[PDB]
Amino acid sequence: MKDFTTYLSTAPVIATIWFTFTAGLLIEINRYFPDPLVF
Amino acid sequence: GMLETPVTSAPIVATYLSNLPAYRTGVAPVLRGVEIGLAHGFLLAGPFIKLGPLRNVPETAEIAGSLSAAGLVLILALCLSIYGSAQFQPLFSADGWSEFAAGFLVGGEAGVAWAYVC
């Protein structure tokens, strides 16, 4: 389990999780606030 | 060692190559040139006549094709002359190659004129 957490701490897995979080956050913001251009 | 093939080491191939006029080793370069020219101009007169730009006009297709064949034979004789001037500074000499190129010019023009006289 320690080795599995080290594997999850490796670089492409963290890039995948972090870009999934960032893309989902932007997707959620563009859903609930549709089409923002200003402010 | 060299690879063995029927194509490079056949006796019929060796006799045919020894009988072709670029190989006889004791005939004159003028004679080699006129025989090679009588072969090549006679074969070269054909496709200019049959496929040239004047091929569909009567009585002038053969004239224009033979005239273009004679022009190409003149270009080939100039090519032979400058090849000899570059390469050599009996067939493989300066005087011998100049004799061979003049013989090719004469034999090629004769072969074109005999392919017309047809």
Binding site: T6, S9, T10, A11, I14, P34, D35, L37, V38, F39 | -
Partner: protein, 165 residues
């Protein structure tokens, strides 16, 4: 107004473009049922289109001859005519989040160079230390100008240089 541009709520090509997009959506709408899911999705599309055009007319945007919103990138002209929300507030918002990312990366690099395996902490990310620096990175402009004023933001000329210089 600015640069000969009319406001979008006054512009006529803006209203023509709104009417044209509604016309295309209702020509696509008129070949289905009423309670069907394509009709529901197209009515949601028309609702979002009307809401978008109303919001852009409400925000005071400037339209041209084509009926399209134009942005003003000049701090004084934007702050004078009420257009700081389109370039000026977005550029300071971007600079805040971009310096956030850069300062958290720089603090992670300085934290992992002080061990016996900096490349190992670069390949396999130290997640508690990375989350610690990611939460502490909110005071990055204050921390950056303090590290500037102490002379510790910058390395001296112990850098790698070529033969020429």
């Amino acid at each position: 107004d600015i640069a000969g541009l009319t406001p979008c709520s006054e512009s006529k090509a803006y209203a023509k473009l709104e009417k044209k997009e509604l016309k295309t959506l209702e020509k696509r709408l008129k070949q289905y049922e009423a309670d069907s899911a394509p009709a529901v999705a197209l009515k949601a599309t028309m609702e979002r289109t009307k809401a978008r055009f109303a919001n852009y007319a409400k925000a005071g945007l400037l339209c041209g001859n084509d009926g399209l919103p134009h942005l003003i990138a000049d701090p004084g002209l934007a702050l004078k005519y009420g257009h700081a929300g389109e370039v000026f507030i977005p550029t300071f918002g971007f600079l805040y989040v971009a310096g956030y990312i850069g300062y958290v990366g720089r603090q992670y690099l300085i934290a992992v160079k002080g061990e016996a395996k900096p490349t190992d902490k670069e390949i396999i990310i130290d997640v508690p230390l990375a989350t610690k620096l990611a939460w502490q990175g909110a005071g990055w402009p204050l921390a950056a100008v303090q590290e500037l004023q102490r002379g510790t933001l910058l390395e001296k000329e112990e850098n790698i240089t070529v033969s020429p210089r």
